[PDB]
Design goal:
Chitinase A, domain 3, 6-stranded antiparallel beta sheet, 118 residues, 40% strand, 6 strands, mainly beta, Peptidyl-prolyl cis-trans isomerase FKBP8
Amino acid sequence: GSPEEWLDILGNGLLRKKTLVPGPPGSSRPVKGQVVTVHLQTSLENGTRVQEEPELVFTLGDCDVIQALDLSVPLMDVGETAMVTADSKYCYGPQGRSPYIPPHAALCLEVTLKTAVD
């Protein structure tokens, strides 16, 4: 969508997504079960960048990435860059991710969806 629009993914207000850069007009959303490739950048609320993965490849919907990413990627077009704001429950939760992500950290995820293939 247009950048000022925020999507409430789950309907509880806790996982929200906006488009930063739209996919080209004819592009479409990926399907769960497809192998997707994304550029992921993860930051904390204070702006500290804690993850960057320029070529994160995974099967969408297989729970092989944090919920915040598995639940938001299906709502992006291939070629889109989105920003996702996610409550800690959808991220690394109580455990965190040593050493850079503490317990109960909300994350901001900038995600570019590059490819989605069967």
